[PDB]
Structures are given as C-alpha cells and as structure tokens.
C-alpha cells in the first residue's frame, strides 16, 4: 500500500539511471545478475545465499539466485525468475508480489537454460555480476565496467521514497530487537542468551541479520570485531555492547547501544556524557558541509570526554594535536548506510568516480563525501580501552600524559559506542533509531 | 583425558593411510588447506567459514583459515597455524589444546606470508584444498589427485575409536536440542520459535550446525529440503518434524523425530508404527550386508503400513511391485555419517572408488557399500503425503489403488521420518540416538 | 578395539611411574610375581587361585600363577608367561590378546626353571610378591620395599582410562546379577536360589566374584558381613540386601541394593529417602574435597532419616551431636574401588605413604584422602537394626531417645544398604551404576 | 537319629586308635587344630576355609577355623570350638548337634587366647595342624610326627559305620547332580550351565564341592584337568563328560560319567562298551587282591577296545606288551575316598608307613595298597584321544600300527571316563554311585 505506491518512483529512478549511463557508455542495456550458491567444497552442503547488491536494487528478491535483469532504461525491465519445480521444495507461487507487475517476467526452471532467454547479440550488454566465467559461456564479453558501477554507485548515495521506507522498517525491528537484548543484559543472561534474545524479537535468522551482530560484555567491549557469543555468563556484569540491525526488503538497519549494568558510578556517567556528544554529532549533518569534518569534530569532542574524566592528563585541544585520541577512538565516525552496510559511494566526489579526499591525520576514513538531501549517514561515536593500542601508547612518548590508574578502572568495562540512523533531507533531519523510542 | 588418549591412535592411522597411499601413488607428502574465508560480492561483509574437510579429519581446527597440514607418513606432521594479531580481534592463544602436541606447529601472521613455511621443492606434494590458483601461485601442480581422494574417501568409512567417540559426543547435544524442540512444539510455538529452542538448548548459533536444520509443522512436513522458518504459528497444531544435528570436533550427529500433537490419533498411530519398522531397519545393520538391500527392505515396510493403514488398497507385496512406495518413500534409507553429514567413501566397492551398483528400482540410492565394523550410517524411513508426487501418481494407472480420502485426512499432517545414528559393532549394533533416550 | 586402544596410554603411565620410583630409590629395576597356588594341608587338592595386584595392574592375567614381570620404567616391559604342555590340561595357543604386543614375552614350562630367565644380578631388583622364601632362594634380597610399594599404592588411586573403562565393563555385567537377583527375589526365592540366578545372569563362577556376595532375607539384612546362602526359602519374604559384583580385566564392580516385597509400607518408604540421601551423597563428590567430610555428611543425612520416620525422638542437628547415627550407620561411607574391592591409596596424604587423619567424630575410617579426578568411589550409606548394637544404646544415657516400640517394627526387615560406584571427572561425575539403567 | 547312634562307635574307634599311637610314641596326647582363614597378598579379602582333614576325621565341623580338639584316647576328648560375638556376623548357637555331647566344649571368643585352654605342659603333647607358627608361639616342640600321621592315615582306609553313610550321604547327593547336568547337556546348555544346574541341584556351591568340578563338552573331554566352564555353548553337540563329587559332613563323592548327544553312532557304541568294562572293573574287588593288579586288569580291557574298534590294528595282548594303552588310558584306575577325595593310606603296606610296591610297568599309581573290609575306593577306566601324547607316539616306530584316519573321527568327541564309588565288604561289593539307579 505505503510502500507498494513508493516503488513505482523507484522504478521510474532508476529507469532514468540505466538510461543515462547506458546511452553513455554506447551500452544497448544491462543485465544484472542476483548471483549463484557456493557449494562447500568436496561436499553437497551449500553457503547461505548472498544476492548481488546490484540485482536487490531493482526490487526485493534477497533469496534467490539464477535471477537475472535485462534493462536499458527505456524499454520495460525484462526479469528472469528462478522458479525450479522439484518434489523436495514448496513449490512458491508465481510472483504477485507488489513488485511483479512492473516486469516483464519469464519463469526459468533450470538454471542451466537462461542461455535462451538472454539477447542474442551480447557485444553492447554489461553483465552486472560474480560469476565472471558463467558470463562467458553465455557469450557476453563487457563485465562489471567500471564507468558503469562507479557512476551506480554514486547515486546509490541518494536513496528514493521507496529506499527510505525500507531503511526505516528495518530500523523499526532493529530497535524491537535492541530492547529484547537490553533486558536479557539486565536479567545477566551470557552473550549467546542475549544474540538469540535480540534474533527472537526481531523475528531474523542469524543469516538474516545484514552483518554479523557484535554482542559483547565486560572487557569484550573493548574489542571491535567482536564475533563469539560466551554461552557462560560472567561471574560479574559490569557493561553491555551491542551492535546488531535487521533486513527489510534488502536495507539494513545498524544500531549500536553500550549500557552499565548499576546505572550509576564512573561507567555510567562515561556513557551518558558520550551520548551527548552523539546526539550532538547526529544533528550536525546538513547538507553542504563534508562528512570528514563532523569526523574532526568527534576526535575534539572525545578529547573533551577524555580531559574532563581524566584518563589523560591534558586539555582537550592539546589531546587531539597530539594524536591521543586515536587510541581510545581508532575508527571511523560512521559511514553511508542502505543495500549494503558500509554503503556504495561515501568516498567519492562525483559520478566519475573520483575520491574524495580525507581531511587532517585521518587519511583512512570510511565517508567523506560531500553530504546531500536522500543521503542516510551512520553515527558511530566510540571510546574504547584497548590493550594493543594502550600498549602501542605506553612505548610512545606520551606515556607520560595518560593516567594509567583510571585507565586500569574502566578495562573491566571494556568500552563505548553510539550508533543511530539518520537520514538527511532539505530543511530536516530523521534520526530513524531515536524517532522509535529506543534510549 | 579420554579423547586424548584416543588421538594418539587417530594420528597414527592417519599417518599410515597418508604412508600407504603417498608411497602407492608416488608422492613425497601431501599439503592440505583448511581454506580461505569468502568474501561477498563487491562487498566488505563475508561468508561463514566451512573448513575443508580433509582439513579437519587431523585436528578440530574447524574456525581457522589460513592453516596449513604438510604431512607424509613418517614425519611427525607439520601445522601452519592461522594467529593474526590485531587491536579489533581477540588475541586468541597460541594452540594448546589435547591435539597441539602431536604437531610442529608454526604461526602464520599474515596469509599471504606463507610461500616461506611450505616445503621448498612442492614437486611431488599434493595440494589438497579448494582453492587451486593460490595452490598455483604457490608453485604446486598436483591438486586434488582423484587416486588420493577416492582412498582417503573410502577409508573414511572405518571411524578410530576417536572419531566414534566425537560423534557420540556430537548425538549428546544434539538429543538437548532435540529435547527442547519437541517441548515448545507442545507448547504451540512457531517454526521459527522450535528452531531457536533447539539452537538455546545446544548451545551453538545456525552457523554451527552441521547442515541448515528442518523445522516443519503440519503440511510443512512433506516438504523435504523445507529451510523456512514460519515465524507465526499455524492455528492449529497437527503434527512437527525437526531434522537437526550438532557438531563436536568437527563431526556430525543428524537426528529425525517427528510428533503427533494430540495424545492419540490415526497419525499418532502411524507415527509408533512407522517408528517400529525404523528400530527393526536400525537392528537389521550386519556386516557383510550390503545397505542397497536394508533399503530394499525398508519398501517392504512402508508398503505394509500404506497397506495396513488403508492408504492404499493392495497388500504390501503389490505396492512394491507396482512402484507405489516411491511415490510415499522417495529418498535413500539412509547414509554413512561423520565429518561430513552425508559422508565420503558411501557409494564405493573398493579404494580405487570403483562403484558399487545399487538396485535395480532405486538406481539414485546413496548408500550401496558392504557394511563392515567401525561404520556409522543413518536410518532415517520416511512415509510423506507430498502433493506433486501424489499428483503425478493420479496421471498414472495406480490412480484407482489410492484411498485419496484417506490421504486427504493426512494432508495437515505433512509426512513422518524417523532417523537414527548407529555405529555398526562386530557383534552388536550400538544406536548412539536412542542410547541417550530421547524416545 | 576400544579397549585396546586405551591401553596404549595405560603401560606409558606405569612405565613412567615404574621409572620414577625405581631411580628414585636407586633399583635397576623391579619383579613382580603373579604369585602360586596354595596346597592344601596333607592334601593334593589346591586352594583358588589369588593373582599379585601388583602383577594384574599391568596386564588382564588373573587367572596364571609362576608369571613374572621384569620393568624398569624405560626397557620394553619383560613377560615370563606360564604356559605347561602337559597332557592332563588344555595348552592354549600363545599370547595373542590385545596386551601381548606390549611384553616381551618369554615362555616358562616349569615354574622352577623360572631362574634362568630372571636377571643374574638381582642386587638391584626388587622382588613385588608373597613368596618370599622363594624370592630369597632365586637371589633376592630386597622384598616389597615400603618406599616402593607406598608409590604404586598412592597413584593407584588414578586410574587410566583403560582402568576406567575396565571398572565400567564390570558395572555392566554386575547390573545383570542384580536384575536376575532383584527377580527372583520376588518370585519367592531363597538366598541360595538368589545367588545362582546373580552367577548365572553375570556368567562368572563364585571364585569370579572380587569378593563374597552378600545375599540376605529378612532379618539376615541386619548382618554386614551374612555369608550364608539358606537354601530353603523363608517364611514372609519382606526385605532383600545383595550387594554383588564382578570381574573385568581384574577390576572390581561393587554394587549393593535394598528391596521392600511389597511396594508398600514403611521400610518401603525408607528406601525411597534413603535412595534419595544416597543419589545427593554420590553427586556431592568433588575434586578438592576430604572424603571425610562426605562421611560426615552422611551422618546428619542418617539422622534427619531418623528424625523424620520417629526412629529418634529429637532434631537432626543433636542427633548427630549425641552420637546416635554410629548405632545405625556403624561403618564408612565408602571406598577407592579398582584392581582390590577396598583398593589401595584410601587413606594417605602424599606419595611417601603418610596417613590422612579421619575426622574427629570417626577414628574408623577406610578412605580419608582427598578428592581428585580419576579416581573411583563407592557410596554404601546405610542404616540397620542390628540387635548387639541397639543393645548397647539401651545400656547408655540416650536410652530414652529411642523408640523401641518402632524399632521392633522394622528389626523383621533388617536394614538397607545403597551402594554406586562413581568415577569423579574434573567437572562431572559419572555413576557408572546408575547410568546403565537398574534403579 | 539314624547317624546319630552310629557316632559312638565312630568316637569310641578313634579313641582307640589315639590311645594305641600316643602310647606307643609316648605323648600324653594329640592336639588337633581346624586351622584359620588365608589372608590374600595386600588385601582384606581371605581364600575359601579348608579344614584340617585330622580335625574334621572326629567330628562334622568343616566351616570353623580356631578350633582345637585335645584328645589322648582315654579321657572324653575335649573341644575348643570358636564362638566369635560381633554386630557383623551372626551369632549362632552353642553347639547343640549329635556330635555335642562326646566332647567336653569350651568356647572359644578370640583366636588370640587359645594358650590357656590348652594344656600348661605341652612337652609331652604333638601339635596336629597346618600353622606350626603359631604351634612355636603356644610352646608345642613335637609337630605332625610322622610315626603319628603314617598310623592315623594308615587306619583312615578302614571306615567306621558312621563314615560310610556319610559317603553313602555324599552319593546320594552327588547323583541328583549328576542328573540334572545330564539333563541341560541334552537340553544344549553350556559348560557353564551344566556346572551350575549341577550346584543348584545339589544345593551346594562351588567351594562346598570337595574339588573342582569337570564339566567338559567335545574336544574338552581329552582333557583330564578341564577347571574351565565355557559360557557359551558350542557350535554343535557331541559329547559331554562331568567329574563332579559332593560333601557330606567333611565326607566327599566322587563320581565321572560320559554321554553322547546323539544317543546312537560310534562314540555312543564305544562309551556303552567301556562301562561294562568299568562294572566288571567294579566287581572284580576282593579282599586279599592287591588294587595294583586291577590297574594291570583295567589296561587290558582298553586294549581289547582298542583292537575291537579299529583305533589299533593289533590285537588285544600286543597293544598291552607294546605300552600302547598308556596313550589312551595314562592315569590310575582310582584311589581310596574318604575324609579326602584322594583319601590317605592308599600306597601304604603297614601302620609304619612302608610303602606297597607299585605293578612294575606302572609305578605311578596312587592306590597300591592291598584291599580289605570297609575300605571304600574308585574305579576310573579311560579312554582319551589326547593330541599331547598321540604326538608322541607318531614319532616312535609304533605309527604304522594305530589307524590314524580313526582316531581323527573321535578326536570331536575328546574322550571317555566312567567312575563309581564302592564300598569293599567281605563277600560282597556296594557301589554307592550305581545303586542309586544312575545310568
Ligand atoms: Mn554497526
Ligand atoms: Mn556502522
Ligand atoms: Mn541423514
Ligand atoms: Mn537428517
Ligand atoms: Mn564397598
Ligand atoms: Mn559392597
Ligand atoms: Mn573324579
Ligand atoms: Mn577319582
């Protein structure tokens, strides 16, 4: 209904996009592969099925490969349905789906007898896709050409009616999730009962999720790439992250929340003063300004948190010119966010596929790309206690500077970050993760 | 202590079949790789890592990429051991568990580092592994040799008495799992709901699992590669199905159960009578039988029930000979199982890897090896109400032998398997499932 | 094969303590004799064969006297192996179990030809056996030297998982006695007809057994050491009192069971909450924890039994001050349970031999030492009407304590007894009794 | 009653013969110990009691160690009996049995004190026991004096009245035995299930029996000294031969038989030939014949059989001339029974001692001893294909005469041996065993 109307503009969107950059390149289409299963090696087994990002694009089939688009940007978009008959699978419906009507749909039944269905002559079609060598065979000869993916990726940046739904109701389980994860933290169930507390609630699989959930306690924290889940809980409870989202319609939601376990003491002030810096952070985008400076603007505003707590012995000004905060905030700010997690186009300039350069002593950030109206950002302030990087602090000169006696207090809490979703309009911001009450 | 001290002997078998068939197919070692982690399509997210499984038949290192096996025989075998070490991942410690003394282990920091570690001269070592133009770049030429393959396949049948004891440990969780399932099914939950229960009691996330689990309700049941998982329930409870395993040091256990929800009822009875012929199939189990022939057997049995039930209209001896049971009964009896859930060296007469024929009727069976000690198979009889075949079976002249008001009644129901893991004893038969009573 | 592969690991053990203890008191190494059989006085018939414990700890041959053993911890383990060809008895084929590939074994065809093959200088050697003036007269001197047996003694109470699954085997095929034993008890049978039926269900003679069966009607219950089989039946059968066990490899299973006839009553009722003190009893086995303790334990266990059934007139806790439970409960909790039923190490603190003092309540005690894994238990908590010993408590202050009156009430029934053997693991406890199914 | 009255003239004839030897050898008179239980090496467990035969020759007391008998053949005999008072052991009666009143008992409470019931001058007294230890300690000097024990053991060949219905007691019982071990051989039981229909039908235990039964099937029965029982049956039934006695009141059975399962063929022919020869082996007891010549009798007889069935191609005096029946029948004919199954004084020619020259070409025979009245004795012809000993003969220049394509026929059925039990009178001869209609 809300979502079905929105689509049609989708469409048209990206009809208009396969037309320019087509018609551009000397292209007569595209054909957009949703990909193949891997199958394990030696094995009859297979891996979970990852849809080509550039195939979900056009419409909402995640979960089905052997899928193919054939699209010019003026003719309608011709799509070929893996729909295989065999005893051992429910036979699914043919496509009545919201999205059916705006395709010209073929049903193929083996996998193997799409070489029919496809143009006769492929010497001006791109195929958009893995499979190079399947490619091939088929006859075609242009694949993946980089003007064609650059210039896609570039305006992946700017998300339709019907994009920005999606990403708001994947949020909106998200967040249903968030609050399953809090409250198993606050009963002191372990990290493996809080994962599948938070997959309970938002009703996903773990092969759902759009990324591998980080659910951390204690010391955990402090780790980033956090992927074990301890199915023994502490002997103490002391702090919870979690970073974890959810799927609509191939958008990922990315929400990160750290919480104390007493509600009170050191632990929970660093938290809730943290929290404001994000909030702040989050309502700083606007059109105009480039993301890499809301980036410098984090470092000063850890430095402050930083100062204030003393865990380092300076001012905020004399903290960041001397590169300190990098240990305890060694990553980006936060990135584009839609189809993919880490989103197509944030580090690029324009269509050509240029870069965009990063700002001051952080030549390795994620987006800094001039943010515009339809762009959805992350937000992602962090302050952590890492042991290498304390380490590799304690070697260096500034050993001196750091009080190492706080620093030995928060270990055991492991370390912050903030995360929301917000989407960026003309005059307006949406922050999709505090408009659904989550705290 | 106890599976330590059956590893001595597991690497000493091995070390003899590596001596055996290395020496036979003039071969100075052979080089196995546990595998490299996949990444996604023009993306930064990955796949879960599935380790090779003539990796894993050494040791269970079963999360780590980037190992390396160099082993011939007669040299105590050398491990490349994958330990990067990063400020966003967990140090993880150097190998010291029960298995670490039985190899030469060197650390690999980087993936990329190891040309240096490998043997100089990789003339006459074959590489065993997927990933064949790294085993190039590597400066190797022999690749998964089919003589090599088909040996170790077929010796792969006769499990060490570590093995054994892996897989009964890996039935030990798995009867938790399926202990739970049932419970919440009782309990009027979802598909979704079961499958959570199973991965709460066992303690491992979806990944883990040997193979993507099957949790069905009702009509769901007949379906037999059924992956969904319904998040809401049906309205009415009739029947449950739940296909699902463990994994303990890298080998599977692979379990069927399936439930009436009423106490009683004319399913409830098929369900204790189709349970009755998978004890006896189970007990059939003698070596120096071929399994092609239990299978034989296990039509005789469902063609009694169709029979007897009044399914179909014609003594057991008729639906055989007509062809019926396929219709009812249409995959194998059952397979070999361990570190792979449909296990290597099943459809083999000798370790060349000569066939063995199967039956004439069922030419697409699994299993048709001679049956001898230190085999593990699966008993897995089925008897489903599966709408494309029972379709296909109105267009032929067997139409009027159907009671299809009678098949009609069962339809809600879906389909009944029952399965079991049996190691197969010299002078006894010990079943691993029902030794731990899950009834 | 299970068995075999275990035992591997189980010479490497003793070699390793043979070596330890051998250099340590500066002996070249040490003989053990398996031992002789007894003559009977002015007769030509012989007494039972008794095989040396310290000769069965290395290898399953109870049942061979004129057998020698020459080790020194470091050479392959000397077997001189008793093997007369003489026509009056069967000459079995040489060594070819599982254990021969371990010895070098040398055949003996009388046992006073044995000194050609025992070492020349035996200055050095310790003789491990009975026969002394036969030691001397070969050339020995050092016999059974304190130092040396206080070693073997002590780490006797670790068992190998060889040992464990030997003393497993031999639950297994006593639980079968106590089931054919347990029926014909209540088919009305006498103890004699009882005691066959336990003898032919196990298939082990009497001189089989690892100690005298105990096997009592009635009365017979109340006395702990009832050697007699009556073999005319009585009158009222009311309570049954077997404790049985087997053999396996020369280790000792050691269960005993209490029954009521009827059902119901109070004795019945008795049993049941006794069983359930005697279950928490066995759970309550931990590594770093004085058996002592356990034996106290069980004390207060007995007396809130007492307490709570008006067999004693007062609260658990003075009960158990006053010195009333040793009445009813007059011997030890239980034992370490191997090669000997009351094996040996059971009371020593260290390796030297020193004692570990019983607590203060019990100068009695069997087994004091502290707990650790791999070691093995008995459980036997109890309670009787033992006539001499109410006797005595009539004859002292806490005479009017009791209640005679319900005292004559169960005197027909005897007493109860509830024996397991338990292996303690680090973080388990496996009761081998109670895990193969007889309640 | 009936027994009863006949232990007076058994008292009063031992009285005597004490009076007669103590004279004679100058001692004020004997003292008799039963003996004590054997501790097992290392361990709380003891052997099975035998009692001292000397002891158990005046009265039925064969279960009690610690027991004394003073006796100089003129005063009533005193008797030190052990009557222990503990809360473990029942405490029977004060011995009130028909052997109470010829002794004047003293009670005996505590092995310890026994050196002040006995005589204070024990110069003059002989010590009659097993522990000559414990004699020293006591003060005894004289100890088994052999003129003492050569007269006792000389005049135990002649029974009393009171002895021989206790032999006659032991047949009885034996027989019944002997019955149903026929019975389950027929019905297709094992070794193992014959011995134990055999113990429970006699009502007596392994260790109440006066020696090891041989239960042998098949190839076993050429064993002579078969202690084995087979728990499982064999492949096929052919032959079965039981040695198996019982005890009466320290007074033992002793009785062989062989059987055939089918009850026709050759085997059957030559066990139905062999026991009349055994019966007219039994009839030929005189008195005044020496049992030496019965032996030469017996050896020819087998060779007769071995001429008759063509097993030897000579004839019947050839095969005895050429020593050939000491390949087929290598034991004695039989021995004395009594108090012990291989009863003293059966080699003896006079009450000093002497002995009675055996038959030359046998001078390895027990009995040599002239027969007389009341002289009870074995008669045991056999015939055995024995592989040991038909070894032996091959490589003498007697092959050519034995037909080895025969023997190879029999070699299934093992062998064959017949034993009675007969009580020699003046001019008649009552075989206990046959009487009792036993076939
Ligand atoms: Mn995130
Ligand atoms: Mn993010
Ligand atoms: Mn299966
Ligand atoms: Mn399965
Ligand atoms: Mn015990
Ligand atoms: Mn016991
Ligand atoms: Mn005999
Ligand atoms: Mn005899």
């Not at 199958?39 to 899928?67: E, G, S, T």
Request: contains cysteine; glycine residues 6%.
């Amino acid at each position: 209904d809300k979502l079905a109307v929105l689509y049609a503009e989708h469409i048209a969107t990206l009809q208009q996009r396969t037309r320019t950059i087509t018609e551009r390149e000397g292209l007569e289409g595209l054909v957009i592969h949703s990909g193949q299963a891997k199958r394990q090696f030696l094995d009859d087994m297979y891996y979970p099925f990852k849809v080509n990002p550039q195939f979900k694009a056009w419409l909402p089939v995640i979960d089905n490969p052997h899928c193919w688009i054939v699209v010019d940007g003026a003719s309608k978009p011709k799509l070929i349905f893996y729909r295989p008959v065999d005893f051992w699978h429910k036979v699914p419906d043919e496509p009545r789906d919201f999205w059916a009507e705006y395709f010209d749909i073929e049903l193929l039944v083996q996998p193997d007898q799409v070489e029919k269905l496809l143009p006769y002559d492929k010497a001006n079609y791109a195929y958009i896709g893995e499979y190079l060598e399947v490619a091939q065979a088929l006859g075609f000869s242009i694949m993946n050409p980089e003007p064609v993916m650059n210039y896609l990726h570039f305006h992946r940046a700017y998300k339709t009616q019907y994009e920005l739904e999606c990403l708001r109701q994947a949020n909106r389980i998200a967040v249903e999730g968030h609050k399953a994860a809090r409250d198993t933290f606050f009963n002191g169930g372990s990290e493996f009962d809080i994962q599948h507390a938070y997959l309970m609630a938002t009703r996903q699989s773990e092969n759902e999720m759009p990324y591998g959930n980080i659910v951390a306690l204690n010391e955990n924290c402090a780790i980033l790439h956090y992927t074990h889940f301890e199915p023994t809980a502490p002997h103490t409870h002391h702090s919870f992250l979690i970073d974890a989202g959810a799927n609509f319609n191939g958008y990922a939601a990315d929400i990160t929340r750290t919480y104390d376990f007493k509600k009170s003491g050191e632990f929970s002030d660093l938290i809730q003063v943290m929290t404001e810096h994000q909030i702040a952070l989050g309502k700083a985008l606007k059109p105009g300004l480039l993301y890499g400076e809301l980036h410098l603007e984090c470092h000063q505003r850890v430095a402050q948190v930083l100062s204030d707590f003393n865990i380092v012995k300076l001012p905020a000004a004399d903290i960041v010119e001397r590169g300190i905060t990098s240990t305890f905030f060694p990553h980006g700010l936060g990135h584009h966010l839609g189809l993919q997690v880490h989103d197509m186009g944030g580090f690029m300039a324009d269509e050509s596929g240029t870069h965009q350069a990063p700002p001051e002593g952080h030549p390795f950030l994620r987006c800094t790309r001039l943010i515009e109206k339809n762009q959805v950002f992350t937000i992602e302030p962090g302050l952590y206690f890492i042991d290498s990087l304390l380490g590799d602090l304690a070697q260096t000169d500034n050993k001196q500077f750091i009080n190492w006696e706080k620093v030995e207090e928060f270990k055991p809490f492991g370390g912050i970050r903030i995360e929301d979703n917000i989407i960026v309009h003309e005059d307006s911001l949406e922050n999709m993760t505090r408009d659904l009450h989550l705290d």
